[PDB]
Amino acid sequence: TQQPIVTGTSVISMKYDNGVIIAADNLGSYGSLLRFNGVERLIPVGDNTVVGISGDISDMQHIERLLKDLVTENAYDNPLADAEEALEPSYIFEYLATVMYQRRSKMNPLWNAIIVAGVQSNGDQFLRYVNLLGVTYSSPTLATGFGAHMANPLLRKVVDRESDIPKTTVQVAEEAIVNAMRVLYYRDARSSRNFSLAIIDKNTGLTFKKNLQVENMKWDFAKDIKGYG
Amino acid sequence: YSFSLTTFSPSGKLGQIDYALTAVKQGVTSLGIKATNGVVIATEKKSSSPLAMSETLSKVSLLTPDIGAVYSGMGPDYRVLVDKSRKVAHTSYKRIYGEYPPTKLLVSEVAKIMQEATQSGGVRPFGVSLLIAGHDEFNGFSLYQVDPSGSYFPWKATAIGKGSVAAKTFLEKRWNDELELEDAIHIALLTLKESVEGEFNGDTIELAIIGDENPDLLGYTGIPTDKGPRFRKLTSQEINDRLEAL
Amino acid sequence: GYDRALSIFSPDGHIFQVEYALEAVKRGTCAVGVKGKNCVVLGCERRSTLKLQDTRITPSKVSKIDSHVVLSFSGLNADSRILIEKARVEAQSHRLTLEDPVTVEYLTRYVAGVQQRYTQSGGVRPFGVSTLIAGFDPRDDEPKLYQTEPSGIYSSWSAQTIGRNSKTVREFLEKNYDRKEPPATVEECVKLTVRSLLEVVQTGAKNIEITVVKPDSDIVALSSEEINQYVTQIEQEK
Amino acid sequence: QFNPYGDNGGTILGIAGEDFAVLAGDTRNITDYSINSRYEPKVFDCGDNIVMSANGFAADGDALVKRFKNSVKWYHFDHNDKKLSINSAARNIQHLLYGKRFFPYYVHTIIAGLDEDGKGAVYSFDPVGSYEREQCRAGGAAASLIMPFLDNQVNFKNQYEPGTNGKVKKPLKYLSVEEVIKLVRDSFTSATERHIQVGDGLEILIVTKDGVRKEFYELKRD
Amino acid sequence: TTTLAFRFQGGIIVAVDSRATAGNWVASQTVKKVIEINPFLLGTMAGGAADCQFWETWLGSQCRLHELREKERISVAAASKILSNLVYQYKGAGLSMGTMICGYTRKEGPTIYYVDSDGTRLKGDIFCVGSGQTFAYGVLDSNYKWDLSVEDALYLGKRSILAAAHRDAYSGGSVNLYHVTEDGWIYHGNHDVGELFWKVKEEEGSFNNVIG
Amino acid sequence: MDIILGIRVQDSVILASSKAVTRGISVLKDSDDKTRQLSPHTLMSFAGEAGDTVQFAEYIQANIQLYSIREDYELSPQAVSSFVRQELAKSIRSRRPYQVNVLIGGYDKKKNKPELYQIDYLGTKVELPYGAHGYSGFYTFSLLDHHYRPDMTTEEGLDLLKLCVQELEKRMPMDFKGVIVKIVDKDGIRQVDDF
Amino acid sequence: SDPSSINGGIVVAMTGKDCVAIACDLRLGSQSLGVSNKFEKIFHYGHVFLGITGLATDVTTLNEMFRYKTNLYKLKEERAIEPETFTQLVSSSLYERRFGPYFVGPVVAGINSKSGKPFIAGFDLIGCIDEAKDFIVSGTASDQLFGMCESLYEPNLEPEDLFETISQALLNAADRDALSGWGAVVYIIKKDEVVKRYLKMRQD
Amino acid sequence: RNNYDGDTVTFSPTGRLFQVEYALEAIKQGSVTVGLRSNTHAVLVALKRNADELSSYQKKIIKCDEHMGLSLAGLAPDARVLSNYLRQQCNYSSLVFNRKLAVERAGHLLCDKAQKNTQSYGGRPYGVGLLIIGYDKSGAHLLEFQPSGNVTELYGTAIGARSQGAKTYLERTLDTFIKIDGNPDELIKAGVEAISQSLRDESLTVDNLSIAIVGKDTPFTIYDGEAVAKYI
Amino acid sequence: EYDRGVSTFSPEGRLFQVEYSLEAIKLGSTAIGIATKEGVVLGVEKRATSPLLESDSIEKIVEIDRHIGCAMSGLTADARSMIEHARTAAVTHNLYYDEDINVESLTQSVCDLALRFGEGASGEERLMSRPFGVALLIAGHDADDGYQLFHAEPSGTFYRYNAKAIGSGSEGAQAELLNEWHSSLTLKEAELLVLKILKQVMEEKLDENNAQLSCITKQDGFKIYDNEKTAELIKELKEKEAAE
DSSP states (O other): OOOOSSBOOOEEEEEETTEEEEEEEOEEEETTEEEEEOOOOEEEETTTEEEEEEEBSHHHHHHHHHHHHHHHHHTSSOSOOSSSSOOOHHHHHHHHHHHHHHHHTTTOOOOEEEEEEEEOTTSOEEEEEEETTOOEEEOSSEEOTTHHHHTHHHHHHHOOSGGGGGGOOHHHHHHHHHHHHHHHHHHOSSOOSEEEEEEEETTTEEEEEEEEEOOSOOOTTTTTOOOOO | OOSOSSOOOSSOOOHHHHHHHHHHHTSOOEEEEEOSSOEEEEEEOOOSOSSSOSSSOOSSEEEETTEEEEEESOHHHHHHHHHHHHHHHHHHHTSSSSSSOOHHHHHHHHHHHHHHHHHSTTOOOOSOEEEEEEOOTTTOSEEEEEOTTSOEEEOSEEEESTTHHHHHHHHHHHOOSSOOHHHHHHHHHHHHHHHOOSSOOTTTEEEEEEOSOOGGGTOOOSOOSSOOOSEEEOOHHHHHHHHHOO | OOOSOSSSOOTTOOOHHHHHHHHHHTTSOOEEEEEOSSOEEEEEEOOOSOSSOOSSSOOOSEEEEETTEEEEEEEOHHHHHHHHHHHHHHHHHHHHHHSSOOOHHHHHHHHHHHHHHHHHOSSSOOOOEEEEEEEOOSSOOOOEEEEEOTTSOEEEESEEEESSSHHHHHHHHHHHOOSSSOOOSHHHHHHHHHHHHHHHHSSOSSSEEEEEEETTTEEEEOOHHHHHHHHHHHHHHO | OOOOOOOOOOEEEEEEOSSOEEEEEEOOEEETTEEEESOOOOOEEOSSSOEEEEEESHHHHHHHHHHHHHHHHHHHHHTTSOOOOHHHHHHHHHHHHHTOTTTTOOEEEEEEEEOSSSSEEEEEEOBTBOEEEOSEEEEETTHHHHTTTHHHHTSOTTOOOTTTTTSSOOOOOOOOHHHHHHHHHHHHHHHHHSOSSOOSEEEEEEEEBTEEEEEEEEOOOO | OEEEEEEETTEEEEEEOOOEESSSSEEESSOOOEEEOSSSEEEEOBSSHHHHHHHHHHHHHHHHHHHHHHTSOOOHHHHHHHHHHHHHHHOSSSOOOEEEEEEEETTTEEEEEEEETTOOEEEESEEEEESSHHHHHHHHHHHOOSSOOHHHHHHHHHHHHHHHHHHSSSOOSEEEEEEEETTEEEEEEEEEHHHHHHHHHHHSSOOSSOOO | OOSEEEEEOSSOEEEEEEOOEEETTEEEESSOOOEEEEETTEEEEEEESTTHHHHHHHHHHHHHHHHHHHTTSOOOHHHHHHHHHHHHHHHTTSSSOOOEEEEEEEEETTTTEEEEEEEETTTEEEEOSEEOOGGGHHHHHHHHHHHOOSOOOHHHHHHHHHHHHHHHHHHOOOOOOSEEEEEEETTEEEEEOOO | OOTTOSSOOEEEEEEETTEEEEEEOOOOEETTEEOOSOOOSEEEETTEEEEEEESHHHHHHHHHHHHHHHHHHHHHHTSOOOTTTHHHHHHHHHHHTSSSOOOEEEEEEEEOSSSOOEEEEEOOSSOOOBOOSSEEEEETTHHHHHHHHHHHOOSSOOHHHHHHHHHHHHHHHHHTOTTOOSOOEEEEEOSSOEEEEEOOOOOO | OOSSOSOSSSOOTTSOOHHHHHHHHHHHHSOOEEEEEOSSEEEEEEEOOOSSSSBOOOOOEEEEETTEEEEEEEOHHHHHHHHHHHHHHHHHHHHHTOOOOOHHHHHHHHHHHHHHHHHSSSSOOOSEEEEEEEEETTEEEEEEEOSSOOEEEOSEEEESTTTHHHHHHHHHTHHHHHHOOSOHHHHHHHHHHHHHHHOSSOOOOTTTEEEEEEESSOOOEEEOGGGSSSOO | OOSSSSSOOOTTSOOHHHHTTHHHHHHSOOEEEEEOSSOEEEEEEOOOSSTTEESSSOOSEEESSSSEEEEEEEOHHHHHHHHHHHHHHHHHHHHHHSSOOOHHHHHHHHHHHHHOOOSSOOSSOOOOOSOOSEEEEEEEEETTTEEEEEEEOSSSOOEEESEEEESTTHHHHHHHHHHSOOSSOOHHHHHHHHHHHHHHTOSSOOOTTSEEEEEEETTTEEEEOOHHHHHHHHHHHHHHHHHO
């Protein structure tokens, strides 16, 4: 049974009408020591899916090597497998879902919480969750670790349910996720000012935005106080 | 009949055993003479080219410090089987008995490796008949022949290989019930010079003894309570000495 | 024909290895079984090879597998010897499972079972032994007689003979025997066995051996004297 | 070390009628004090008039359903389109639960369906192996809340006619399929008010012999 | 949980309850805790529910199989010790059992064998197991006789469960009554405890300390 | 089980076995044996933990019986005892250990001499004229020296054994509710009815 | 008690001039219950004697195991094993099962028929050569014996003086050992013959 | 000569394996089956055999899965292994990737299965050829399987007894059935025509025809009996 | 060559070795089964090589369930393994679904053990080293297809039938079944029909020691008849043909 050594923080996710925005921090803590910076935690898989991985960096690598090898496997045989038999976020999820159970039944799990986000090639959003317990669920807003209780209420204002999805567009989605990173920088011990953010859209395709910096700082309430004891 | 290890013949016996015996006879001539304080073991070397190093052939290989060997038969079979023999000797009889094994016991293990290579069809037995001479503190100096038929016999003087038949009568005639090691060493060279001439010389005939304890070869000192190697390999220069006084 | 090997079938549909296995059974001593109503008698020829042969320690041709089932054999004596021991480990094991002694019907299947198994496979030859298994059930008192053959086929017979000129005893048996009334007295049934065995020995009263199984785990081996009296009755009447 | 187990909430209920049977469940999903999901059907079609809901531990639940669907197809192949009855399924689920008993599953399973007298049937399972025929049994966190309320409106247990005071008592009556649904809607709503792992939305699948239909009803998100 | 079986001159009565708890709340009241192995044998679920359910249906399969093989009838001794040898293999893995195999053959009579998950096999005539086992024992022993009416044996098999419901906390539900005759078992219906309580209460003038 | 004794006299061996079978807080049966014949003149009693006792007794029974058939001649008690010791001492290093302790009495018909061999659970063969395990041996060993003589008739051994039952009864909480007394002699193995 | 020596027993080996002795108590115990008065600790194979102390089940098991190992040797070489050689044989049997190991303390005693020289050895749980020829003691009275023996020990006593010296050491020690106190058997071993002499001593 | 059969592990001097060709023979001796397809359906129509007129024919279409299916031609014990193997893979795809198996990836797995018997001493290359259809995400496909293990995509093919007559039908009418899409009846009807022609000394019976179909909105369905009596 | 192989094909595309196994099936005794809409009646011929042979304690109709029976011919040796496997399959089905096994499905399991011939071939791990010299007539009743008769062939796979004969007399028996069968039969008719055809293809005399009927009638279960029942039907037959 594997015990956490090097770990990441959290992933935050929402849906809008034509895509998903998955974004996650970049940290590699070993306990309190922020050991590693620049641990890139979004990994593109195929061309219409970004898989965000939190939990162990130990286990992140193994999963990285697996999903790269997923595209290698898909690409063996088939003269068309990029518009006819490509990977879609439904496929990618179910692979990892099956290993997580398998390793749990060996009593030796792969310690990660993973969120698989993407657009299908039928034009239907897929954002579904898996973790080390093997627990799986889908919800219009997903978030992991600290960010599950912490940074998910904001996003749940924007998209609460299925019926609020055609009325949220890309710009609104984008402001929510950045707005959520500001809470996580402030008010979670494990956090990073850098964070990687990928916009998956069905109509524009894959867009990667690298090292977006937390902003709209407030701190002018720390000069208000003088503290007390 | 003759021609599986599996098939028995009308008068019996396996033929593969007989054919493996044939192989030995195509070999080189090795011979042993038991004296009352030793056993001398001798054989020759050949290699075709004279550009060959002769001191690289293994044919006089100590299994243990107490017990030397020679062969006649297949060269390849020797190295492998010497290797195997040693390995078994420590497992069954140096981790248990606490010292390097008896001359009688070790000869039985060697026969048992052969025997396994007869039972399993499609697997030929070893091309070699060895002579294995040694010393122990119970049965004294001893000499054996262990055949590729997986049976071993004790002997007073014996020879094996191509030149065996010529050597054995020399051995009958020249053996006496009481000999010294030094009269045995000279009788050994004399007989072996029948096997070949035109090429016999002290650097191409390999001859060794299992004689008296030598602390010279022990390599650690200030322990009187153990004995040193019985085995001694004589160098090329010694073999020339003995060949001049003959 | 297709005796080069066991697994290959045969245009003629007869596996040759089994057929030759039968032929081997005729080598060994004659054994005869005759059921009564309250008895089964299991007799066998005990052929004496030399006069130096012990009666001190030398094996009888009849072997008890368990304490109420009896077994004779005809065939390759070498082969019979492991067949009888294998029969026995299971037999005893039957009690380990159930806490019931060995039923004769379960036992014939098992003996046919080890044999069937050897035939099915290719990397073993069949047993060259046909056996007669006689006995009664533990639960009940009706006499039961079974046969196994090399093939792995088992039967029940009222009375049956195997090994050493089996044919001639078989015919003898038909004529003497009655299926309407099997003999209901242990002695008269024994006597029928002795008459059969007489034939194959030609002359002997020290080479006829009789064993009897009776219900409730009675198995007895008959005295050499006791058999000679029965021979005495049979020679006088003839 | 590691707890391969957990609890992820929900509450489910099975009713056997006499021409229908329902299996209901809320669409809340919890992990401890987080609300994961506002809508995620816990009640899944398996075809052949079998609805199956395995609730407790969400990891064990969703793999137990998955394995069942593979088994259903293999029955079609080796029996050339034979129907799988509800008791035949009920025994099949025995060996799926008992098949790791040394590392067991960790879900309370209820299947609801139709028997071969053509009346409601529910068999609900003990989480490690074993089943019994039920008429009302509820699984999950608020099973306590929902179950005895239905053993008074459906079962008529410890109830007795007016003014008679036990002399004689009131018989069961035949039911409409709608009326059964209102009883399920009330029970769930009361369990949202009195409990923290119920609400969000309520899925009730009704098994009739016209097929497996779905009827979904909004429920309280607080 | 309260199970029992008792032997008489007429056959075997088996009688069980139907209440089982998880926590301090009742999962089911409709539990069947006699499992019908085959027409000739009956055995009881008691101890842990899951193990008993799984391994008694297995044992009837084995029984069906042996009857096909031998062209016979299963023995009570044969069935019972097939279960004990199985449970022994699995022991040390949370395995729990309380089952009594009840069977009436012509070749051995009615017989009852207790089996545990430790592989314990006990011949006897009287058995009661459970956690209400003590309460029902009270009832069982003092009214037991060998010479006994069928009618009054069926009366005893109701009375063991009835007392036991009131005093034990985990026993109740309903009474299930069964009679194993030489020709197989015959069911004598299900009787709810409550309705049974008032009748008996009147009949012997017992349970006058139980009022509420 | 809850009482187990052995006393060896002039021409017989006497073994006592518990009737009671205590399982949790209820005695499920008050009249069951805890002894099985190995052979017609070799008798093994057993005691220890429940469930171990029953499968072990039967397994050993199968083996000694199988040897007896093989050689068509019965093994001597001396042989039998060393067989039963060997299984226990192997088990103590195996996956599943037993807690079955045995006394094996036999009227040796080759040395024409009664022999009692006590064997404990861990696996110790000792020849001894007394024998008992549990906390029954902790009363009756002391008692046995005085009232024993160098020999006595089987009748006097019976009365001597009854005296140890009386000692146990008084001073030990465990119920056994009488004993089965089986004698092992030269003419078979028999049951004597005793209180 | 301790798990490797609940059932007790004591063995003591000494060297004299061209003689050994070995002696042991005959009490078997099981906790606090004294079980049998006759039950020897020491066993022999050919002309080598061995006592094996410890948990009583393993003394009995190795008695049998060593007999199997010795006799395979004897028949094959056509000659007796010697007590020099026999030392390293105990050492390997004990070490084979280092994990789940034999709980014994065996002590050899013996005199070569090729030197005429006393050889004694001790081994632990998983075996060691303890090749002192001072005197070697093992058992539950291990502590007690090392001192009692030391006090008396003069090297090179005559055989019959050696019988006085080891019997006395053993008897004092035994009274004050909880898990042995009954009986004694003393072996006085010589090249020519081996005399076995039981003591008469107190029971507890 | 012909002493280079007797082993499936020996190449002949010419570089054939006689053993695989002799597997091709076994096919011809069994029943004929025809494959053909469009772009909205794939359809298989197969001649079923009986052994006597108390016998009720033999099924030669096995449903693989609800979007796949195959016919057999040649030995029936060889057929059972492959249709079972093929199903493992389809179930695997559903369990591990939640994905319908692709016909092309199926075929190369089948190829592999075959080459396993070809290299090995022991065993035989399978004595059956299968015509495999499916409809996946890339629409309808039809493969032709052989004992060598070669899978080849084709718009239409036939294997088995006297199959040249059906292949002749197919050639002539190749383009007519490709262009028809949306009408399930027409592809059904066209396959009927081909297999009539294949026959020599026989006539069509209501229990000879077996029809197997998969499409865009057609589940796998196996027609026999009075279901092939609309389209007799 | 092709026939002394075991996985060696002939130039016609027949596995000759496996072909040869069909003549094993025939050597044994005739059994003729006839399916009807009331039940399946299975008859046999049992050979007596001696009066001393107990022909009535040996059978070749066997019980597999309580509504599945099997007739066999060939090696009773191979019939022991084939019947034992099939019994296991019925019981394990009963274990898994608590439901009747279909006639056909029991047949699929009997044909799975049959597939195995090999020592290198793939599909399932080959452990059985030759073909089986034994066939089955498989009889049962599921209620969703009715009474059915299937024939297991160890060299092929499961064939549906209204009637089959297997054994020595198979070839001539089959003609008579082509001639006389009907869908208008009752089981009473059907029983005297098995017997009327059987005798003509018999070389032993038609008597009860050399005969034995059983039925699968769902109501009555698998029922092996009496010798007294079989003797009755011989008389009724004799009465019929005199009239005729």
